[PDB]
Structure formats: C-alpha cells, structure tokens
Design a protein around this ligand. Structure first.
Ligand SMILES: [Zn+2]
Ligand SMILES: [Zn+2]
Lengths: 396, 396
C-alpha cells in the first residue's frame, strides 16, 4: 500500500514539475531503477493520469516522440469551505484552477442539521452542474476550528455547535470519493507554498489575521497541523501582562488587542473619548473603513494600525525565535493598510528576535485571501504528490 | 532503497516491542502481505538482527518453537558527546545500555584541531577497548549548537571555534561506520520519548535549562529538529520589555534572567545589596548551592528560584499555546529545587495558556541529565526503527 504510494507520488511530482520528461531522466532524478519506473508509469498511463507520445505513435502518425506529462484535462475535484453562516462549493480542474464556484447561505447551527444540509448541497451541486462535471477525483473541505485531518473529524468550531463531527467519513459515505478535511489556516499556508507567495522556500510562516490570530507553519516543505489542526495558534499568547480579560478567563491575550473586534472596539473607544478622526461621523466602522482611513492618512487610524503592528510583531518575533523561518507572509483584510502595518511589525521583529534570524527575512502579502477554496486545492495537489490520491484513482 | 528501508524498520520495531511474535501476527499488525513479511524477516535473520526457533530446530533439538525476537547480544554502537572542553565516548549495547564510558578533557578550540583530536580519540578507543568491542554498527554524536542532522554538519557551536564542520562525513571517512550527528537538546527529547519520561505520549516538550534555554519538541512521535537543529530555542524570546541588554544586542531576552550565569549573578547582586542569606558567606556560589539553599528553606534562594520559575512558566506557556503538548518535562540541575520551582512554573502556565490546554498537563522531571550519551543512543534506536541502520547492517 504505502510502498507503491510513495514512489508513485515522487514520480508523478517529477512529471508534473519537469515534464515532458524521459523515463531515463525520471530514473536518474528519482533514484529508482528502470524496472520500478516502468511499473509506476504503466499504472499511471493506464489510469490516464499521465501521457506520452511513444515511438510507435510518433512514427505511425508522423509527429515527434514526446516524454511523459501530466494529463490534467478531464480530471477535476471539488473544494469546499464551511465558513461562518455559509458553504462554498467550487469545481476545480486537477491542476488547481477554479471552473465553477457557488456560495450558499447556511442558517443551520447544530451538528446534525449542518451535516444534513451540506450533503443535500453536494447532491444538488452534482445535479445542477452535471454537464460541466467530468472526472471528479476527490473532495477537499476547509474550515476554521479544531480538525483531525488524518481522521476527517471536526472536534469543534466557531459559529456552529459541533462536537466530533465525522465530516470526512460522512461525505465519503455520501459520494464514494476520497475526502480531505483540514483547518483553513493550515491549508492556506500549504496553498501559499504550492500555489502562492511562499513557493520559493521550504520554511515559512503564514500569519492569518481575522477573527482570530493563527500561524500556519511550513517546515521542510510541509505544514505543521497536529492532531487538532491547531499548531501555531497565536490568540492566547499573553502579550500584555496587565491587560484586558479574555473570553478564556486569562488576561492580556493577543486576541484582546488584535482580533477584528478588538481593533474596531479600540477605534470606537478613542472616538468616544474625543480623539479627532475622519471616522468620527461614520456609522458601523469596519476593518476596511479603518484601513482605508489609515491608507488615506487619518492620524487616528494610522495610530491604531501601528499599535496592531507592534502586537503582531511581538507574536511574530516569538515564532521567528522558535522556528527560524526563511519567509513571513501576512494574510487578511489588514493588508489594505500594509504600507502602515508592515514597518510597525518589522521594527518589533528587529527588537525581539536575533539579528541572524531576521536579516534576510522578507515580510510579504499572501497571494490568496478571498480565494476561499484554494486551500482545499492545495490538499488535493499534496495528496497527488504523496501518491495517496493517485492510488485511489488507479484503484478505480 | 527507501522502499525496503521503511518496511524493514516497521517490522523490526514490531519484533523489538512485541516479540516473540509470529510471522502471521507481524503480517496482521504491519498490514503487509506474507510474501513481504517473508522477504523482510529473511534479510533480518541472515543479518543476525533477529532470531527465532523454527519448527525444524524445535523438533530437532526438543525445545519449543519460538517467534521472532530481536537479537541484540553481540551488537553495539558508540555514542559520543562533544561537550564544553571535553569529549565523552561510550560503548553501548544495541538495546541502549552503557557498557563502557570515558570522559576526555579537550583543550583544542579551533575546528581543524578539534576534529584531529576527536578522530585520534576514536582510534585510541578502538585499540584500548578491543577485547570488549564486538559488532559495532554505528556512531552517534550529540553536541550543543547549530547542527544539520541530514548532512552531519555542525554549522557553529558554543566553546569551540567552528564553521560548517563536516563532523559526520569525517567520522564516516575515518571509520567506515554510519554516523548520526544531532543537537544535544533535540536528541535528549528523543531519548525521553524512547527511553525516558515521555514514553507514554506522542506530543511532548522537554525544557532544557542550562547555559541556554531550549525546548525539544516532540510532535507525532518525532522530534522537531529543523535544518539547523534549533527548533524550540527559547533564549531570545523577549520576556521583559524593559529588561537587561542581551549579548545579542536586544533587551529583555529570556537568557538575561534564566541562564545559569544570570541566576548566579542575581544571587550575587542581592547579597551585595545586603539581603540576608545563608549564602552570604559562601565563595563561588554554584547553581547546586542555590538549589540546596532553596530546598533547605533559605528565603533568598527560594525567592530566586520562584522568580526563575515565573520566567520559565511564561516561556513554557508560549510553547503550550503553539503546540498543545500532552506533557512537559523539565531537565537540568535546577531539578534539585523542583519542589520550589515547579509550583511557580505551573501558576504562570495557568495564567498564560488556555485552561483546556493545561488541564491534564503533567509537569515532570526528565529521566536523563548526567547520562550524556543516552541522546546518541536514541538516534541509533530511531535509525533502527526508520530502517536506515538495519539496511546498513544488512548491506554489510
Ligand atoms: Zn485568552
Ligand atoms: Zn537575546
């Protein structure tokens, strides 16, 4: 099982990244014997996952012999996001590109009702888009919360009332397809490594700034997930010893000063105290509004964003110290004020981590944010490279 | 190569932990076909790494047929520590137990001279202990500093003047034996998982308190090392925003308050300022002296240890937040005052990490500290289980 799987993935990754490629070149690059290369490629050819123009075809039809390449056309997968009060279902081509996507509002809260609705929506999707669906190989689903990826179990999550929902097994039962379930921040860090702005390093950290604060840590080309998909959670690191009480019951947690709500609340408090701002007449201040005010030079909004940067910089300095990453990516709507935020983050990184660690350290914006299903695409790409999905497709 | 290797290690680990065991039981447990089990066990038997009493032997010699067991007797390895101003060479039996150990004082500083001395000492060891040496399979070496384990390269280290010393390749050239090189803190965390006080969990953190402060992080049964063997370094995390200048040039680093030197310096300063203590007449105060004073009820020493615990607790709370470990181990001479230190650490853990994360969280003393070569023993045991060393032994 795991025997063939690993080598099949290694060979397929070489073909995907380096094709058209000869069997002899695959043998040299993979360090596998020609006999092994032959057996692996034959299974992949017969499954129509890869293709070549053979010598016999070349002579027969009067065109050049061409080395092995991935045969993505016709192959597809579903990538889903279970978000706060909604479900996104997207159809992707195997290479990762979105073909169709729909966002469905979800007013269910309790586990059984959420699951019933989600399966109904998958069924409806297959019926509605039947003509555009071809060879669907798998389903990926990403979501906030505690997720056991190995088992496909959501232990608990924001918004919904969930306790150990067997999301992967349930979707697999309803579809017969392999299902890949992951925490969204962790899967997003993988998408940045496979498709995004951390392709150039094997050691990086993605900092997700939204409702909560989380780091998706890539070490040696793979994301750290853990049994609960929570490796890298930043929100309950104490950053102010004498700070506000957190929902967790402790004081001075990062999320008391750096969550979307905490930033909006700060702006609201300073305006109420009589600090001047272009936001002082605005109803229902959003993070977008704050970022647009700061970007446009509003002293109060600038100051609020800089303070946020200092706190983020402190948390990021911690991660740098522990992981020695080669790159830092920032993701979230807060990137709309990056000209203001980044210098604040960077100065605190310089002051709170080793010079040698942060010397050539790029601080950059993530490629993805509103592409909610690209994280699921990354899970599928990595399952092809791990050989897991290849064997499922070969097996039938 | 990697094909056979992985399965050979999986089978060998089953035999080591569960033998005497039948081939059918190995087939069921490993999920490998009998044909594969046969091929793997045959190579391991012929290499004399495992043994059984076959049916033919049982009938022939009138004793019971006995399932496969590891055949450790006769097999050995060397485990070395390059410490500050010394080299320890120990001969171990393959199961991990020490047979001979010697500590050699080393007054060399520069890379070339250090390496020349170390190879001379290995040569001398083989000659001196020739009668006690049997089948030496490998050499493990652990040391403080930045270590690339994959390559066997020491990038830099304390005490010695080192820059990218190819320690593994050089020892391999001088001996023909496989060489396993690792950072000492990381290899120690592995020894605790394989031989020590974290055998019962797959997710743990070892906190090493000595010259520096480091966490050896075990995730899913394996230690996080990184390309530089420095994943988990704690010493330059800023724990006091308005603190002492560190050797790194930044202010308020953990090692400014928690290194062995910083503790001794605190005691020295408070006595000079006129604070009463049983240590106030003692020349050359050691950490052992401070711990013995605290354990014996000296108010000043107690207060110094409690303050240390608060700072360690803050750093450990950070690691808990990021990793959600199932167990925390503390290693170092400071364990001589654990009755005083641990409650201080624990209260700060409660106040600076999620209740759910630290509820059933045991804080315990490490099994090893003065067993300087047990970390190297762990590297060898894990290389057997990974199958790497098995294949080297089979290959001849
Ligand atoms: Zn909190
Ligand atoms: Zn420092």
């Amino acid at each position: 099982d795991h025997i063939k799987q690993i080598n099949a993935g290694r060979v397929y990754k070489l073909i995907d990244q380096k094709g058209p490629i000869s069997r002899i070149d695959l043998s040299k690059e993979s360090e596998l014997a020609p006999a092994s290369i032959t057996k692996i490629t034959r299974e992949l050819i017969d499954a129509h996952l890869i293709h070549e123009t053979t010598v016999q075809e070349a002579i027969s039809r009067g065109r050049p012999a061409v080395g092995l390449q991935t045969n993505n056309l016709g192959w597809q997968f579903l990538s889903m996001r279970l978000g706060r009060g909604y479900l996104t279902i997207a159809l992707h081509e195997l290479g990762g590109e979105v073909l169709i996507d729909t966002k469905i509002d979800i007013h269910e809260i309790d586990q059984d009702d959420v699951l019933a609705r989600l399966l109904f929506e998958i069924e409806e999707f297959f019926q509605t888009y039947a003509a555009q669906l071809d060879r669907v190989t798998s389903i990926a689903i990403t979501l906030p919360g505690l997720v056991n990826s190995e088992q496909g179990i959501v232990l608990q999550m924001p918004h919904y009332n969930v306790k150990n929902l067997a999301l992967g097994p349930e979707i697999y039962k309803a579809t017969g397809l392999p299902v890949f379930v992951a925490n969204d921040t962790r899967a997003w860090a993988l998408a940045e490594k496979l498709f995004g702005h951390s392709q150039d390093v094997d050691n990086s950290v993605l900092i997700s700034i939204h409702h909560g604060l989380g780091a998706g840590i890539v070490l040696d080309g793979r994301v750290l997930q853990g049994r609960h998909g929570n490796i890298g959670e930043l929100g309950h690191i104490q950053i102010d010893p004498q700070g506000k009480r957190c929902h967790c019951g402790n004081y001075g947690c990062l999320e008391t000063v750096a969550s979307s709500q905490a930033i909006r609340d700060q702006v609201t408090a300073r305006i109420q105290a009589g600090e001047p701002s272009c936001l002082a007449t605005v109803e229902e201040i959003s993070i977008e509004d704050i970022c647009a005010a700061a970007a446009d030079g509003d002293p109060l909004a600038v100051d609020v964003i800089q303070q946020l940067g200092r706190y983020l910089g402190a948390a990021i300095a911690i991660v740098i110290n522990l992981f020695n990453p080669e790159k830092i990516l920032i993701g979230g709507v807060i990137n709309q004020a990056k000209s203001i935020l980044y210098p604040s983050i960077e100065q605190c990184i310089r002051e709170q981590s080793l010079p040698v660690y942060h010397q050539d350290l790029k601080l950059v914006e993530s490629r993805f944010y509103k592409q909610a299903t690209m994280p699921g695409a990354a899970l599928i790409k990595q399952a092809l490279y791990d050989g897991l999905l290849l064997m499922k497709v070969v097996e039938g």
